[PDB]
């Protein structure tokens, strides 16, 4: 109650502070090593790094300036940098340093050794309902935090969710986050996770993240997305139709929650209603969830990745326009 209401306001007050007075040019590539290549991506490339003056291992995301200007998306990559250094939450990947050279752009994150949720979901096949609920609670808390600041996340998918040593979720890839207070008309994201109003080419608001959460929960519980067609143009017809069928092993509470989250009529979708984010919290599916213990990280995770050192990366797979960029 009051503890949630008093505490949010302080987060807002702190967020604006770092939004106004930021810091830039924290580090250049002299103290960074080049060990591994953790990920890929359609824009960047992420590789493992260590600081030899401290010894701590870090991740570093490298973006191409020319590619960025070629892809006709320049504001997104600057807004990513702007947002990542301002937010502060235990389920968000933090930022340490920022780079600025003549060729590329680099950022320094914390290292999350447990690998993606996607790989473990495909390895195990599907999660049980308590296992899925453990992660869904964290995602609900993260969206409650973000929407308090008028921030849309707008890219939710298993490849963006990482597992840390304790088994908790870490959210990354803020490439499409935007400070919207009102409406927006940009079409971006992964087609299976897009809301109907995004496809219909009309203004949309922060309600899209709850549709993405419903799709995420469905995919965790079943192992395959609710809207699956071989062609992107055919996926849109299934999304606009909004007709889903549930696996026989789904419970009634899960089906009711997913029906209320995957609601085509955005005036009837959970989280956008008069109660805000309390229809989700008070739902019968979350009856056995302790929202304080989850936030304080005192609940034992159902899965602990077997990390074997700071330099170990076994959980992962084996792998100029200076005018526009004036905020790095």
């Amino acid at each position: 109650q009051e503890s949630v209401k008093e505490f949010l306001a302080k987060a807002k007050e702190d967020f604006l502070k770092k939004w106004e007075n930021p810091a830039q040019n924290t580090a250049h590539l002299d103290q960074f090593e080049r060990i591994k290549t953790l990920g890929t991506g359609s824009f960047g490339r992420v590789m493992l790094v260590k600081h030899m003056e401290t010894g701590n291992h870090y991740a570093m995301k490298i973006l191409d300036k020319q590619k960025v200007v070629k892809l006709k998306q320049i504001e997104h990559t600057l807004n990513e940098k702007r947002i990542l250094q301002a937010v502060n939450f235990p389920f968000l990947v933090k930022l340490e340093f920022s780079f600025k050279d003549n060729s590329n752009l680099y950022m320094v994150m914390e290292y999350v050794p447990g690998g993606e949720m996607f790989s473990h979901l495909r390895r195990i096949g599907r999660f049980s309902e308590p296992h899925a609920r453990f992660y869904a609670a964290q995602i609900v808390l993260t969206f409650e935090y973000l929407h308090s600041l008028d921030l849309i996340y707008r890219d939710l998918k298993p490849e963006n969710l990482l597992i840390d040593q304790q088994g908790y979720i870490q959210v990354t890839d803020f490439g499409f986050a935007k400070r919207v207070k009102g409406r927006t008309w940009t079409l971006c994201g992964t087609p299976e996770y897009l809301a109907p109003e995004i496809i219909l080419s009309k203004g949309y608001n922060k309600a899209v993240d709850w549709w993405a959460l419903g799709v995420l929960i469905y995919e965790m519980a079943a192992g395959y997305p609710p809207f699956f067609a071989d062609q992107p143009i055919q996926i849109y017809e299934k999304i606009v139709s909004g007709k889903v069928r549930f696996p026989s092993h789904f419970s009634s509470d899960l089906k009711d929650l997913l029906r209320n989250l995957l609601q085509v009529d955005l005036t009837k979708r959970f989280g956008n209603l008069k109660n805000g984010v309390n229809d989700i919290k008070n739902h019968k599916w979350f009856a056995t969830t302790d929202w304080i213990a989850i936030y304080q990280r005192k609940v034992e995770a159902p899965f602990i990745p077997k990390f074997k050192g700071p330099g170990d990366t076994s959980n992962f797979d084996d792998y100029k326009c200076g005018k526009e960029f004036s905020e790095f």
Binding site: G125, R126, S128, S248, S252, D253, D256, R259, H283, K284
Partner: protein
């Protein structure tokens, strides 16, 4: 299959139902074809309605503390229900105010009422408009209410089926096929019709409040004298309904037991024929019938008194309210006739419409509560799913089927790609271990861990309707390479070649067309074709010869799936040699676990798992007047009762005519004396009502007729030849023994009563009026002709549509039966959505016919009312214009004729309903006309000459020109490959198929004596064991011939004493679900006990020891030596050890029998078969 024209029809076309004209035009001239049936509207699809209802039910469960299904239904269908209620009410309000307009018109014929004659034209215009507005308000509302009710029923049926597949294994023992078939059959048609009746529970009080105020202004305070009489009559009916409900609730329980016994006995008809048990089964069924028919008669007696209230109140309601008025001052005839006119509507509202609505609410809410109770039963728990386990571990598992634990501290561990061999004696718990692994039997202690992807092969072979290929593929994508490899590995390639249609031969429910080993190998092929991590094979080599068994084991289990983890239940030592681990059970305890060494001290590449739910022409193909006279003359008492009723009717007509011809507190003048006939017609419904001296015997005899017909139907079914019975389906038999019998018992007797009552009223009124004034009959003739012509036109298509709808109910029951039989296989493989889609297809098939039937019925009713309205308008205007300065004599005749036609219309609707109900009688008679199939045994000498056997008259011959002889008192061994024809010869001895040739026993030809005498000379052990619901003693001897001493002695000899004493009631324990509490071998021992109990001189044994271990086989060997000393035994068996105690051998190959003397001579010729003999038997056969 065309589109429904309702979707693209105009507003005016939909309002008048003109879009039904093409099918009526088509069906009147010639027989309806398959293309005439239209595709159902999108709103009526089972998928959409199921989603609609399921959403609300899940919200109800997730958001309420006491969930109610009526709330879920209310949030789906309320505002359309209340929408049509308003127009139904507005069409009823019109009915109450008609006497205000028509009474002033009738009064204008009298020259005295000069005021009414000044405004008669405007009154006629108003009445003409009132008819038009009434006819347009009623029928569309009734059709909409029917449509809502049909949608509700479809949604509830879908939810019930989706719940059925989730029921736990512990709660399933308490639910039979009869209970579910009753739950669906009762609500099938009446639930849709009830939605139209429901609204009068509030319409009728308002109609009474209006009519009492209208009657009050005629009779100031005297109307309440009749109001109190109607109140007392309403309380009387409210008391009768409760007794009816009590009797129905008591009766409800016996029908399920009758249905389950009937279905069990019909599906095992060949065993019943072989045992000659038909009369005993008939005796049990008629004992069950006799109990419930008393409750049926009592409920019919109550319903008669409920139904006759309307007719026996027409005179007293007006008399009690007019007499206190007429005494204090005189009354004119006009006021009496107006009182009658209002009292007709008052009586119809009070004694007909209100109690029916109350009863409809009772039935609907009771059905909804029962369905809600079904939807909240305990469910099956889904297994843990984890692809990264690759290890099957069991530790300290103890379990109970409830006492003694079935499993007691079992431990084992097997890795990826290994084979486990489970062995043990009969009843050790080998099947229970696989049930525990599958999750169907929850352990009370211990843990079981594995990936969760399993494939299962049951010890009882389950076969679903469809082709062999559909059985093997079992609802996934067809892959040609794996299909060919699996077919070749399972040795099915030879048997498929014999079939004329190759792999696409259509199999029925249960696959009775196949042999035992063919069904076993098809089940094994279905198991192997599926991609899984763990394979559970429950004794697949039970009905296979040694050579086929060896080939399958060497090329399918150890080679084709050598990289898969698998558990094999087996007793053979050769199979134990190649197993990595061995587990031996003994009374549920781990007798041994370890390796055999210490005992003696590519196709699965593709992911095929990755229908349509609508009906096409192929699905519809299956669905495609001396009946009254035959129904009446079944029972002579019905003829006597009808003659009695006719004589009393004629006496009443004569008395009423004399009294009327014979013609103060009542004022009558010469110019107003015409009201006598109007009052007589108004009160004739009471002077001609059938009292309890006529009403009760009629219903009693009508119930007796249905009893006789059910007995004849059962007798005819049990006597039919096997060729006829194989083509029948389980769902059709259940349909015809449930729905038609229920209709003949409940609906028909009380509907015929109302039809006869209405006919008598109309005929008596017409005759009495026309005798004293012949111009009324001339006026009534054309309207009668019009109604008869329209009825004749309509019935041509109505009867065909009704027959189609009646035939469309079978696939639903067939799917329900086959779904209950194979539930564990469905949950093991994971094919629930496939069967849900098939059930939706069946529901859509039924809806396609039912919707058209209802639409054409509505069209007919609206046309009848329109004809009546147009005749009334014409005669009204003629009457008003014709009258001049004096008496208007034409209008009197015309208006009285129309007043009679008003009742004729209701009689015609009752006739249509009776004709609708008579289709069930037609189907029952069609089932009765099935064709009929039709000391001496001292030594047992048999002689056969030129015997030919074939299953279809004019088909392929399985055996050709068989000839051999048997000496008296000799054991003969009958051996051969699976599917060669060993069972066909034994069926040919009993003449269970089309046979040609000659067989003699001790010189007596089989054409000399009757078939019943011939079959009584044989004792049999069928390959398929038949067990019905009943005690042990009843199963052992249904005829109740032998005392418990003899039964206990035989059970001790056979080794059943320990098994029987396991259960609470020793020899009194009721066996349910075909002896589900017994093991597979205990059923073999039950059959052995049955064969021992009946002392016969010739014994036809069909593999007596199929699945038994070598230790238990000693019981059969000892019984053969001792109990059957001086008997001719023909022992058909695959066990090699059983051939030691034989003196003659018969081998079936290439469709003919070869005869051998010694087993060594037999074996030395067919080397390949001799190489398959195990070493333990090889030393025995070659000492």
């Amino acid at each position: 299959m065309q589109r429904s024209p309702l979707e693209k029809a105009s507003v005016v076309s939909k309002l008048f139902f003109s879009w039904t004209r093409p099918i009526l035009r088509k069906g009147y001239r010639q027989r309806l074809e398959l293309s005439d049936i239209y595709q159902i509207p999108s709103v009526d699809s089972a998928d959409n309605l199921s989603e609609k209802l399921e959403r609300e039910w899940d919200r109800e469960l997730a958001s309420k503390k006491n969930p109610k299904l009526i709330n879920a239904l209310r949030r789906c269908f309320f505002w359309r229900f209340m929408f049509y209620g308003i127009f139904l009410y507005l069409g009823e309000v019109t009915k109450a105010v008609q006497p205000l307009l028509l009474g002033r018109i009738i009064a204008s014929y009298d020259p005295d009422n000069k005021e009414e004659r000044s405004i008669a034209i405007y009154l006629g215009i108003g009445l003409c408009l009132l008819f038009i507005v009434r006819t347009l308000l009623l029928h569309p509302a009734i059709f909409g209410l029917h449509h809502i009710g049909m949608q509700m029923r479809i949604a509830m049926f879908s939810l019930i089926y989706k719940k059925t597949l989730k029921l736990s294994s512990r709660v399933l023992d308490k639910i039979s096929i009869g209970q579910l078939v009753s739950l669906l059959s009762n609500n099938l048609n009446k639930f849709d019709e009830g939605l139209a009746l429901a609204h009068f529970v509030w319409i009728a009080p308002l109609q009474v409040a209006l009519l009492m105020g209208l009657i009050w202004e005629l009779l100031q305070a005297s109307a309440f004298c009749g109001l109190g009489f109607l109140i007392v009559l309403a309380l009387f009916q409210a008391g009768l309904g409760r007794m009816m409900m009590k009797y129905r609730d008591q009766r409800a329980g016996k029908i399920s037991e009758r249905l389950v016994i009937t279905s069990e006995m019909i599906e095992n008809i060949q065993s019943v024929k072989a045992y000659c048990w038909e009369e005993a089964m008939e005796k049990m069924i008629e004992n069950l019938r006799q109990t419930e028919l008393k409750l049926t008669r009592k409920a019919a007696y109550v319903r008669y008194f409920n139904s006759s209230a309307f007719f026996f109140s027409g005179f007293f309601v007006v008399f009690l309210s007019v007499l206190p008025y007429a005494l204090i001052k005189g009354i004119i005839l006009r006021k009496i006739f107006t009182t009658i006119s209002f009292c007709i509507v008052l009586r119809m509202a009070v004694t007909r419409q209100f109690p029916w609505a109350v009863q409809t609410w009772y039935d609907s809410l009771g059905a909804i509560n029962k369905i809600q109770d079904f939807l909240q039963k305990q469910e099956y728990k889904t297994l843990e799913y984890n692809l990264t386990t690759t290890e099957v571990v069991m530790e300290n598992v103890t379990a109970f089927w409830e006492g003694t634990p079935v499993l007691k501290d079992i431990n084992f561990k097997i890795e990826r790609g290994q084979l486990l061999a489970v062995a043990g004696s009969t009843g050790a718990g080998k099947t229970s271990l696989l049930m525990v692994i599958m999750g169907e039997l929850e352990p009370s202690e211990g843990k079981i861990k594995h990936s969760g992807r399993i494939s299962f092969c049951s010890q009882f072979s389950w076969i679903m309707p469809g082709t062999i290929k559909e059985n093997i593929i079992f609802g996934v994508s067809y892959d040609e390479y794996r299909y060919r490899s699996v077919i070749k590995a399972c040795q099915l390639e030879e048997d498929i070649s014999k079939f004329a249609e190759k792999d696409n031969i259509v199999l029925g429910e249960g696959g009775i067309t196949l042999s035992g080993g063919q069904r076993a190998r098809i089940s094994l092929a279905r198991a192997v074709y599926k991609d899984a991590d763990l394979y559970l094979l429950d004794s697949p080599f039970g009905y296979l010869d040694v050579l086929t068994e060896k080939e399958i084991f060497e090329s399918c289990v150890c080679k084709l799936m050598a990289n898969k983890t698998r558990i094999l239940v087996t007793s053979k030592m050769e199979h134990l040699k190649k197993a990595d681990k061995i587990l031996i059970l003994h009374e549920g305890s781990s007798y041994f676990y370890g390796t055999f060494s210490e005992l003696q001290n590519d196709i699965y590449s593709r992911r095929l798992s990755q229908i349509s739910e609508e009906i096409n022409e192929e699905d519809l193909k299956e669905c495609f007047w001396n009946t009254y006279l035959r129904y009446i003359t079944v029972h002579k008492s019905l003829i006597f009762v009808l003659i009695w009723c006719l004589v009393i009717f004629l006496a009443e007509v004569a008395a009423s005519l004399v009294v009327l011809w014979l013609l103060y507190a009542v004022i009558i003048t010469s110019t107003s004396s015409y009201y006598v006939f109007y009052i007589y017609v108004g009160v004739a419904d009471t002077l001609l009502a059938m009292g309890f001296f006529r009403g009760l015997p009629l219903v009693h005899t009508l119930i007796t007729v249905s009893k006789i017909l059910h007995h004849k139907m059962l007798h005819s079914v049990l006597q039919a030849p096997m060729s006829t019975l194989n083509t029948l389906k389980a769902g059709g038999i259940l349909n015809r023994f449930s729905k038609d019998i229920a209709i003949l018992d409940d609906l028909l007797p009380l509907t015929i009563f109302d039809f006869i009552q209405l006919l008598l009223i109309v005929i008596g009124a017409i005759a009495v009026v026309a005798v004293l004034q012949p111009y009324i009959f001339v006026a009534t003739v054309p309207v009668i002709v019009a109604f008869i012509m329209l009825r004749a036109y309509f019935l041509q298509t109505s009867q065909q549509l009704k027959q189609l709808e009646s035939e469309g109910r079978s696939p639903i029951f067939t799917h329900l039966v086959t779904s209950l039989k194979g539930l564990w296989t469905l949950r093991a493989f994971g094919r629930q959505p496939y069967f849900e889609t098939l059930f939706h297809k069946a529901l859509n098939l039924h809806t396609a016919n039912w919707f058209l039937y209802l639409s054409t019925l509505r069209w007919f009713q609206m046309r009848i009312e329109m004809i009546f309205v147009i005749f009334f308008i014409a005669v009204t205007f003629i009457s008003i214009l014709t009258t001049g300065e004096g008496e208007g004599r034409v209008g009197i005749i015309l208006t009285l004729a129309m007043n009679i036609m008003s009742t004729l219309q209701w009689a015609v609707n009752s006739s249509i309903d009776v004709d609708s109900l008579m289709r069930s009688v037609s189907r029952v008679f069609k089932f009765i006309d099935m064709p009929t199939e039709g000391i001496w045994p001292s030594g047992g000498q048999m002689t056969v000459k030129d015997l030919t056997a074939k299953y279809t008259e004019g088909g392929n011959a399985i055996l050709e020109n068989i000839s051999f002889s048997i000496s008296p008192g000799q054991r003969v061994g009958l051996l051969g490959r699976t599917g060669s024809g060993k069972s066909t010869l034994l069926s040919a001895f009993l003449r269970l198929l089309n046979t040609e040739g000659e067989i003699q026993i001790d010189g007596v030809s089989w054409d000399s004596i009757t078939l019943q005498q011939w079959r009584k000379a044989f004792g049999v052990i069928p390959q398929k064991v038949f067990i019905f619901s009943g005690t042990f003693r009843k199963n052992l001897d249904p005829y109740e011939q032998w005392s418990d001493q003899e039964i206990w002695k035989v059970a001790d000899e056979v080794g059943l004493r320990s098994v029987i004493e396991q259960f609470p009631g020793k020899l009194d324990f009721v066996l349910v679900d075909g002896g589900c509490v017994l093991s597979h071998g205990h059923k073999q021992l039950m059959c052995l006990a049955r064969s021992v109990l009946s002392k016969a001189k010739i014994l036809l044994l069909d593999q007596p020891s199929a699945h038994l271990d070598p230790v238990t086989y000693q019981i059969i060997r000892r019984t053969l030596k001792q109990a059957f000393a001086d008997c001719t035994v023909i022992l058909c068996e695959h066990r090699i050890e059983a051939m030691l105690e034989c003196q003659q051998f018969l081998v079936i190959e290439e469709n003919k029998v070869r005869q051998y003397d010694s087993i060594q001579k037999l074996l030395n010729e067919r080397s390949l078969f001799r190489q398959a003999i195990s070493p333990s038997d090889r030393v025995k056969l070659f000492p």
